[PDB]
Design a protein around this ligand. Structure first.
Ligand SMILES: [Cl-]
Length: 194
């Protein structure tokens, strides 16, 4: 069970531990307030940012202080997705708890996305003072999410499409046409580490 929504935003890879195997999935930092589609009662924390923005879909396992320093001016909801196209997503009813801060580069890029289409590119990394932090898990996100889904990944890492500043990330998400109609991802019920 899930809901298909018209939506524009920026995809981000997540990893999930089921004690035996690490698997991969995706969330999207979606533009707008979509908090009515949050179905995990742990992901019920909201971050209001210094720039006037509001981010929904967060849990206690996210560093909220770092989320509140993001240069996001509008509403962003981070939702799990099992399918995405240029203009829609499919949000599963079974939703994992979102943890950590690697969704921030996508949420910043989704906030200043002016194109009206989601870029065909996934983005990972935490944001601190207009820069992407150094990356830890791009290689594992490549292996478990982006490469099997057939889509590029941007990260502060030379094993991704490399971006260091929020300004560079904005340029890179601006022109990413869809090389196929849809990407799909596995879902999990286990904590999603973004
Ligand atoms: Cl370099």
């Amino acid at each position: 069970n899930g809901v298909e929504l018209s939506a524009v935003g920026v995809l981000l890879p997540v990893l999930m531990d089921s004690g035996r195997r690490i698997s991969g999935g995706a969330f999207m930092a979606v533009k707008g307030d979509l908090s009515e589609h949050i179905k995990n009662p742990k992901n019920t924390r909201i971050a209001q940012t210094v720039a006037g923005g509001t981010i929904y879909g967060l849990s206690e396992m996210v560093n909220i202080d770092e989320a509140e320093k993001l240069p996001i001016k509008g509403a962003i909801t981070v939702l799990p997705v099992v399918q995405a196209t240029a203009t829609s997503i499919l949000v599963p009813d079974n939703q994992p708890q979102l943890a950590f801060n690697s969704w921030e580069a996508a949420a910043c890029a989704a906030d200043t996305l002016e194109s009206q289409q989601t870029p065909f590119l996934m983005v990972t990394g935490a944001v601190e003072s207009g820069n992407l932090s150094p990356n830890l898990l791009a290689v594992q996100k490549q292996l478990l999410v982006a490469k099997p889904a057939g889509i590029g990944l941007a990260a502060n890492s030379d094993r991704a499409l490399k971006v260091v500043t929020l300004e560079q990330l904005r340029q890179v998400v601006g022109d990413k046409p869809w090389r196929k109609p849809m990407v799909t991802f596995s879902s999990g019920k286990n904590v999603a580490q973004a």
